[PDB]
Amino acid sequence: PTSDDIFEREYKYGAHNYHPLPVALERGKGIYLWDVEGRKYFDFLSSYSAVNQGHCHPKIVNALKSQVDKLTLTSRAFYNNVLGEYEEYITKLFNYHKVLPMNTGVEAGETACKLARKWGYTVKGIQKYKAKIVFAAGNFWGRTLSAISSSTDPTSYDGFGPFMPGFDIIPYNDLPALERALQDPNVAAFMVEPIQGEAGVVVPDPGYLMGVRELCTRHQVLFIADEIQTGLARTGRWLAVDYENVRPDIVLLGKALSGGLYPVSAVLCDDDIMLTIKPGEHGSTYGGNPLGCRVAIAALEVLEEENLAENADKLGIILRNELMKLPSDVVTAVRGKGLLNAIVIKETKDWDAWKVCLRLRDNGLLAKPTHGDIIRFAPPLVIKEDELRESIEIINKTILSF
Amino acid sequence: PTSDDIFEREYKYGAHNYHPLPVALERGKGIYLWDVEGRKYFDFLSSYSAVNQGHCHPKIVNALKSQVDKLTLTSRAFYNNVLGEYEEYITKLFNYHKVLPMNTGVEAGETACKLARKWGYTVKGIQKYKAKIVFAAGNFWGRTLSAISSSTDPTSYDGFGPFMPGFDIIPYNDLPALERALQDPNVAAFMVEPIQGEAGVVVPDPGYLMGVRELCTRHQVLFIADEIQTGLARTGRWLAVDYENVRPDIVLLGKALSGGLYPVSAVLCDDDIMLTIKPGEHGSTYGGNPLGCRVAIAALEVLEEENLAENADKLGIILRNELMKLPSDVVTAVRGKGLLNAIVIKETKDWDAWKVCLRLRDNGLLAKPTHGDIIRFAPPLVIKEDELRESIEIINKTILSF
Ligand SMILES: Cc1ncc(COP(=O)(O)O)c(CNOCC[C@H](N)C(=O)O)c1O
Ligand SMILES: Cc1ncc(COP(=O)(O)O)c(CNOCC[C@H](N)C(=O)O)c1O
């Protein structure tokens, strides 16, 4: 089937909840993706930061192939031999007492909201169902009825029935607004992204995370750091939060936790918070299955062994310096950390972010516009300087061809 | 590590949201599971109906091993070659216009709630945020803040902050209550399980589903059938709903959709409902990835080719007839359809469902008590009559040994 047959078939048998860049991939390895016509491409999206270790990384693939012959799912009704191994590894790696395994990113978020609320009632002493959770405008943590309830983006909540009560929204990168919001003794937690990904890679001012930690601690409020897209070497550290050396009360992980081979997410925190949930009070069918645990352990090792954090840090700096050379009347802004970057295209009476991506595609590079005029540049953390240089050249020639 | 080391390790590094039957499995094939001491067991839980095709079914395993070398995740920002193939297959198999791919079961539910609400406003004409969705008491469709909001089980909602508005709860297996509830013109849908699984396999009276369909159609309300645990041959048909020949407006699938090798769920419905959601109004990172689609196609073929529906129907009848021979002062009730059955143990001043399961385990069979005194008996649909007979004998000797 041609790319056109592929596009047409999905349009007929699948929901129209997406409008993808017209490219039909069928194979991918490392930083490259090949479509059905054999055309090769640089991947500058990494599946929203899920394939940080590059597509089909051999070590993770081996772990999957190995475990599938033994066991894949027993459910948590019975114990399996792998889960506890994974748990000990990840908790010690991130330095938290326990981990609660889930599958998708939203589930990690929902679980965090449930931990905060339960903790608020059983430990903080908030009266039943009066607990609040504060969010920062621009946030994105999923597509569930609750996740869209804290959203400020009309496209995610508009027309989606009544919303979840108890969610307060304050401006992002604003300590005064946080302190003001934390005056209410019924607030159990504050959930924030160290860098807002889907918003368009909006980076907060230095000192912000440190202030959030201080403010939360001062008001006996839980600091929930959503590291589902910024964590795992993407920004240049194990956790974006590490840049300010802060320790959140709850950390959320997902996406790259499996290298893109299996839906695996996790929420980490100490006993005083984790143990508020008793047996039978929360779960998931596939959450914590043997197969997902093997790929997770493998995916974490790849990040550590191949020192992808420092590679991400160095190259990100090169990438940004090069992007900043583009003409201001084209690229109005360049921002990011590590390999999580974005540029703001000055949308005009001619071009826009979509068109740049269409031509970028035509020149061998894949990317996607976040909010109409923003273009994210996030290649797998296994990319090499020379390869980065070649792609930078593709970005330059495309940008300067309009 | 011994089973005891395994138990101990999880207790230290993992959340205590579960209290599993003390058994540490490490390998499973077909209807069997082997623990770390080499002890063999009959699996009568099937991971909550996720491994209907038996553990590590060769055909599904092959599909996974094959696709992993090619592509695993591109995100829906770009097209991949597999998704459309899966979509055409599943939509035609179940006879619906389109399918919206998700990962976990709760996600399928959340997506269904969003479809109903969006349809209610944009098509039915309900005023913004006045749309309601009716649920039946005893229902279970997940662990998200919204899923627990429609729950009547204290263990899932107690202490979990304020709840989602717009959810009405009526008694299960009650047509008069449904009609009464559907008098409110703001009701967009009714979500029901053809047989309530986690409740304890509670089967509604014959004619119920037919009445639900008639009532919903009469009030221009969407009939959402949650077939995440009852569907895919488990009850003796492709869908439990098939027993009354009814066609729901939206069908939810999950668990066995992948044979236990990958988290894959789906929601099926016609264009008039599906197309209410526009591009960018709903999504998921891993939802619809190439890898999950390959295992799904394979998992569906196994069910069809090996005629697991009829096998489930025949053997279920044998299983129930045999269970009904047990003494009334021990087993107060036996119920189910196909291989989705349960017995009610008369809890006394001596024994309870947990103890029966402990001894059942000691005799070579694994099962789990749903609500303190109910024991579910759900073995993989690949089980053979002789094997079923051997397990029935284990059930008898254990039951009659108290
Ligand atoms: C009928 C039904 N619908 C939806 C779901 C939710 O599926 P998940 O994949 O778990 O999101 C289920 C739930 N099956 O319950 C098993 C219990 C689970 N381990 C729990 O603890 O959450 C069902 O049955
Ligand atoms: C920061 C962050 N937190 C949570 C999640 C949600 O993860 P899911 O695995 O998607 O459940 C994300 C993900 N947002 O990117 C996914 C976009 C997707 N196309 C959508 O429509 O849901 C992030 O970034």
Swiss-Prot record, chains A, B:
GO terms for biological process: arginine catabolic process to glutamate; arginine catabolic process to proline via ornithine; L-proline biosynthetic process; visual perception. Changing T230I: In HOGA; decreased protein abundance. Keywords: Acetylation, Aminotransferase, Disease variant, Mitochondrion, Pyridoxal phosphate, Transferase, Transit peptide. Homohexamer. Catalyzes the reversible interconversion of L-ornithine and 2-oxoglutarate to L-glutamate semialdehyde and L-glutamate. This is Ornithine aminotransferase, mitochondrial. The modification N6-acetyllysine is found at K12, K29, K70, K325, K349, K355, K368, K384. Changing C357R: In HOGA; no effect on protein abundance. Its cofactor is pyridoxal 5'-phosphate. Transmembrane segments: none annotated. The lineage of its organism: Eukaryota, Metazoa, Chordata, Craniata, Vertebrata. The modification N6-succinyllysine is found at K65, K70, K325, K368. It is found in: Mitochondrion matrix. Pathway: Amino-acid biosynthesis; L-proline biosynthesis; L-glutamate 5-semialdehyde from L-ornithine: step 1/1. InterPro entries: Aminotrans_3, Aminotrans_3_PPA_site, Class-III_PLP-dep_AT, Orn_aminotrans, PyrdxlP-dep_Trfase, PyrdxlP-dep_Trfase_major, PyrdxlP-dep_Trfase_small. It catalyses: L-ornithine + 2-oxoglutarate = L-glutamate 5-semialdehyde + L-glutamate. Its EC number is 2.6.1.13. GO terms for cellular component: cytoplasm; mitochondrial matrix; mitochondrion; nucleoplasm. Its main location: mitochondrion. GO terms for molecular function: identical protein binding; ornithine aminotransferase activity; pyridoxal phosphate binding. It is an enzyme of class 2 (transferase). Belongs to the class-III pyridoxal-phosphate-dependent aminotransferase family. Pfam families: Aminotran_3 (PF00202). Changing G316D: In HOGA; decreased protein abundance. PANTHER family: AMINOTRANSFERASE CLASS III, ORNITHINE AMINOTRANSFERASE, MITOCHONDRIAL.
